[PDB]
Amino acid sequence: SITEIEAYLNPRMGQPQNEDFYGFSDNVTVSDDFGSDAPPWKQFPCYSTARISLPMLNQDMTSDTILMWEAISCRTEVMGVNMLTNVHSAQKRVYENDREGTGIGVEGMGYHMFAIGGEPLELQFMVFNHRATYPAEATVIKNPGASSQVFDPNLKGTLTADGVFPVEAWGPDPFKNENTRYFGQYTGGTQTPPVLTFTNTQTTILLDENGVGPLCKGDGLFLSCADIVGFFTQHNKKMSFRGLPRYFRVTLRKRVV
Amino acid sequence: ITEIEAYLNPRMGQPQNEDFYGFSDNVTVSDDFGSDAPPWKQFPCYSTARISLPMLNQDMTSDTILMWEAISCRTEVMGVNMLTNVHSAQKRVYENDREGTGIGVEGMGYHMFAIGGEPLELQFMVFNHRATYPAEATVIKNPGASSQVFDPNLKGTLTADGVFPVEAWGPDPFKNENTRYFGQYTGGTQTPPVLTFTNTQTTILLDENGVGPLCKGDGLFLSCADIVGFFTQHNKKMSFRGLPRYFRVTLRKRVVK
Amino acid sequence: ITEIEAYLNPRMGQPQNEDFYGFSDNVTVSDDFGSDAPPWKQFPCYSTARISLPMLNILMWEAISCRTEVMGVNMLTNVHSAQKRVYENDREGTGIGVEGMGYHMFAIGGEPLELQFMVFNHRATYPAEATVIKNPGASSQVFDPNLKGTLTADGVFPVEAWGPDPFKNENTRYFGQYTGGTQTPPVLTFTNTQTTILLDENGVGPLCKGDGLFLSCADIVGFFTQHNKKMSFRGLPRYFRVTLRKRVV
Amino acid sequence: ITEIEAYLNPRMGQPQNEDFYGFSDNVTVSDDFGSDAPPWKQFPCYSTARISLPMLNQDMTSDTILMWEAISCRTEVMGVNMLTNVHSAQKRVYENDREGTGIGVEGMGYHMFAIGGEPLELQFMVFNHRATYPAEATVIKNPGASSQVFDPNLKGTLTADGVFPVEAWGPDPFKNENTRYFGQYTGGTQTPPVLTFTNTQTTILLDENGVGPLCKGDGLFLSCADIVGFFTQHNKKMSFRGLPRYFRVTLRKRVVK
Amino acid sequence: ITEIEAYLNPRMGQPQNEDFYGFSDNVTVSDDFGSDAPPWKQFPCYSTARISLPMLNILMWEAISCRTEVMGVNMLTNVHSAQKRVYENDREGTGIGVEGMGYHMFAIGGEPLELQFMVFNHRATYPAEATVIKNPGASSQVFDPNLKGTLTADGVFPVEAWGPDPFKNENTRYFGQYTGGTQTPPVLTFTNTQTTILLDENGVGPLCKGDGLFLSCADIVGFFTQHNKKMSFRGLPRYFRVTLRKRVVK
């Protein structure tokens, strides 16, 4: 009847896994104008995503009856919020002219989004500057045209790979995702204090208007997120994205479809 | 029950399918109220569309009249993901050191949408009545001192896309019996933008009598403005940045008295 | 069950039908409490109106619910009209727009709003045009039960001298929010979908004495800062829709 | 029901019926913790009153007695209107230009109130234990370093108006079984004050068991502190400003075992 | 029903009962990640206690609800005690008071709080007094399922190195809020009227194994800034009220 799965998604802020700056981007470089804009690889965050294999049910061959895992609810937590109490690790100081005070810690933009679905997250391509040339490592629509600075119904994608779809080029497509629930919050600024909450007591119902949760096609549960907590500012004023990992607990029930 | 999905692209000032689509031109500021003539492209206008619904009645004088009734909607600001871009030609956090991220989009948020069975009914109201609007804009000319506050003579309806200045027109609470409108303004120029998005939020459009907007001429009228803040260049020139809005409207065929 | 719709224009200080309607005159600041004399037009006053209801008067019109909206929020997207620039040294950027304190209050009642006199500085000399308690004394800086008024005139009771009296107003509902500061971003919402019930703990709405519906408000949105750094209050008008029913009293 | 209405004037430091009633004296700041001595009038104290309720004439020897039960209250901060004053001898926004409004009251908000059937029970706790409070103030003298956090030995009761320093005493959560208290602190020195007022908000005072405060000796105990922020003079001297608080308490006669 | 009331004092770094109890030592900042070594007393640690409940034996104590309050919020109205002044150039104005980051977390359970190790900089060398995973590797900058602990001691698990483990804690409820920055206005509320239900989705509260009730918290209120601009963590104590019932388990 009921199964719980638990999973994590580590952030993909830009710096490679299992090296000293895992969880961070490379230092951000800023172009002089829109026509000379080519953000280098490692300097911008990408979406995290994973497909969790569920116990065989939809692909069970003992019945012609179609059964699917239905995600009825979830808990999700940003993990490692504790680490942001660190104001000693090589941070620009509050009173930098006097070489005094705490580090300024992680400050600036928060972008927190997650999606839970029975198929890959469907994406709309949309960029601040269409003339940005994304690097070879990134999955983007090349030469997308001026229409990609707002909504263009031709510019679609699917979140099919971890750590390569730039956050700044792709977002959830509200014209699709009938079998996914997604949630996002953006708080801008470069000196904004991060605001994060964590608890193991908060449940999100995933049922739609008709009382139906995401249905897991091919016995796959699709988890996606981005958790930009803000910027790390070094003594030399170089700034990098810092990300945190996301916990998922999804409650599923066997459903006759 | 029929569901329609639609988008409204922002009309921040720069023309469609040119390099600054989604932005205004750089804002110039007048020395005084007497010599205040904002050039075309430097200010945002409302977005609006009439969606053609399936044609119902052969004749509007009939003993039984069918109309499409909007009973609920979902709406999302799209492209919030793009505001994670702090590399595209933005004034830097530490401009004196030529270092840090771009400051990103900051400042005023103006977010409003309306769903109705006829054009949005507007009240004309301006900061400075002596402002001279350009030929491209729809405004009340020589509105007089009274137009700085409420004057019951200064009415209009949102009959055209991309030409009614946001700073000159607002929703008329004396009218709009057949439209639901919702707005939030956060002011300032360095204010952090706060935006949320989800495919899970439904707004019921039924009034206190249990009646939704009724679509006159089988037209569904969608209106919005989504100013997310200002883009600041290295040379400190500032432009409005806007985002497109998604609408999902659930309609039922209703017999109407 | 009849519906009334009304507007109250703001009374920020500058005269009606002239170029600065909706604004105060530029704010001057005293050197000390003793010499403090805010000139007429440099401070906002309460807006009020009595709406005449259909003759009834035993029966009385009972206000059961209302909608209220701050109108013209749209105009605050104007950052071009003679405003101090974001980068004033560089002579560049948008205007800073309207910023600073927000004071939003409305009242709906069956008689004039009952007021408590209370001032920041008791030694302030208000102008002849303003309705105040003259020489109110030091007790007027906090609560003094002797210092009462009623909001009987539009555009003359200073906001900074009079507030709603919680010891009275048994036949009025009032609601207020203050956000201070001089650089604070204004935050305003508008919708035609929000209804406030005016029934009290016993299921009785304001009862309209003499078939009068009394509307009051103040809507300070913030300050307008000119290039020369002179600052004025900016206000917005308020919409009221009040649903009344005939009640046997 | 029986309704009681009362006010508590603030006790910010400056004496009643003199020109600075509602204000503290200008705040001085110690060079170090060891020599810290906040002078009388430079810091706020709690306001408190006992209201005599109608006598119930009860045999305190018998099995059944009547007590006044506080079932609900309305409370309002009064005089919020006065904070629209930016002309009264305030540091100007553009002090270098001798131009702009006064900066008005800004900085810390501390709003607390208590309603009980006996005096408010206090826990002594201070920022700096080596502070020497003046003779006029009720404190625990030489409290020791444990007074900077929780020390179960350091108790008090709020038995006098205007002499218990807000900065040395708070509500004791280990007691106060017969009192309801509510507090909010917003810190900073340039923080915008945020206050609401309405005659339409009721707070229920019944506990988990459906019992409100029971008025011992037919006495209703009201306590508050309402620091709205600081007044800053042209010469940058800063003082606390407080506002008075209104109480409306609904009481019923209760049969008590 | 039985009620427990208890307090936990903060562990901001300075030793108990000395003049700076409730504060950290002044925070020093490394030049780089490789040489990063936060000295003992300059960082906050978790507070924890085990409450020994009355012997029952089978029955177990079940925590069904709680109230919790941050105590001493009143003290933050102090702007006179050796604080950097608002107008330091004029040597005038109040103290700036406590400003900056708020980290508020509490946990109530029937066994020790289960922890996930996670650090800003894996190359930080923690002092001997602290309980950490030594040389934890680059993976410890994000989630590594190998890097686990349990909150077994008061005032030694660094806040910046351990957080509640969402993959465990089936028998504990935990709640946290972080507001960052260094000049942020602190926002704190207190009341004796707010109850939190501790029952899970099946109507079962934490069950107290070996009749032990486990309380854990951290309450960083912000930074104290001296005239000389040296900055220290300031913390506040937390009150717990836990409502318990006897439950037949076997």
Ligand SMILES: CC(=O)N[C@H]1[C@H]([C@H](O)[C@H](O)CO)O[C@@](O[C@@H]2[C@@H](O)[C@H](O)O[C@H](CO)[C@@H]2O)(C(=O)O)C[C@@H]1O
């Ligand atoms: C709120 C207030 O008291 N405003 C004063 C105003 C200010 O005090 C002044 O602008 C600050 O420098 O001053 C006013 O004019 C004053 C004259 O009446 C007086 O004779 O001379 C004063 C200078 O010594 C000052 O010019 C004003 O600007 O209107 C009076 C107003 O009440």
Ligand SMILES: CC(=O)N[C@H]1[C@H]([C@H](O)[C@H](O)CO)O[C@@](O[C@@H]2[C@@H](O)[C@H](O)O[C@H](CO)[C@@H]2O)(C(=O)O)C[C@@H]1O
């Ligand atoms: C909070 C506190 O300890 N306040 C002191 C105050 C401050 O220490 C002082 O303002 C910081 O400069 O000092 C007070 O007494 C002063 C003497 O300490 C000083 O030597 O002489 C001053 C007169 O020039 C002054 O009298 C004060 O300012 O009142 C005493 C207070 O407790």
Ligand SMILES: CC(=O)N[C@H]1[C@H]([C@H](O)[C@H](O)CO)O[C@@](O)(C(=O)O)C[C@@H]1O
């Ligand atoms: C977090 C950290 O690594 N702090 C180290 C600091 C800082 O590097 C310097 O104070 C910056 O100049 O230097 C020490 O000599 C010190 O002052 O005790 C050793 C300490 O371990």
Ligand SMILES: [Mg+2]
């Ligand atoms: Mg099958």
Ligand SMILES: [Mg+2]
């Ligand atoms: Mg669709």
Ligand SMILES: [Mg+2]
């Ligand atoms: Mg109407």
Ligand SMILES: [Mg+2]
């Ligand atoms: Mg107790």
Ligand SMILES: [Mg+2]
């Ligand atoms: Mg588990």
